[PDB]
Each structure stands twice: as structure tokens, then as C-alpha cells.
């Protein structure tokens, strides 16, 4: 079974700063199989604010410059695994 070894963590960042959400899976799953969401909206590959990466077991969602409207619930979903945490923008 696919497991999440390391779950997302809540993050609080100042406006303009970088935020990142990461998780680690039990096996290497290509980035194409993962879906990230902010407040229920799927993150798109041409979103100028958010970057999605994967390296082996390690998946990440990066926000280079946080703004207040980015705040809310981050979801990661891959196969049957789901995780969530919260972005707070100070």
C-alpha cells in the first residue's frame, strides 16, 4: 500500500516570504500522479505563484512570495493517499 511517511506541516509566513509544503511517500511516484490543491482548487502547471516538484519519495508545493489571498487549506492527493495542512499568512 502507498503510505505517507512524512505528512504536511502547517506553515505561517510573512507576506512576501516563501512558503513550502512537503510530504514523503513510501515509494517514488512521479510528479504527474500527484495533485495539489489550495482551498479545493487544483494547482495548475502554469500557475505563476505556485511550483510543484517531486524528487523520488519527496513531493513539494512551493509558494515563492506569499500573499494574503494564498492563505488556507493545502491538500495533497496521490493514488489513495490524502494529506492536508494550513497556510497562514501573517
Residue numbers in the entry: 3 to 92
Task: Tell me, in the authors' exact words, what the paper reports.
Titin is the largest protein in nature extending from the Z-disk to the M-band, and interacts with a number of sarcomeric and signalling proteins. One of these targets is another giant myofibril-associated protein, termed obscurin (OBSCN), that interacts with titin at both the M-band and the Z-disk. Obscurin and titin also interact at the Z-disk, through Ig58/Ig59 of obscurin and the titin ZIg9/ZIg10. The Ig59 domain is only a part of the titin binding region; both obscurin Ig58 and Ig59 domains and both titin ZIg9 and ZIg10 domains are necessary for this interaction at the Z-disk.
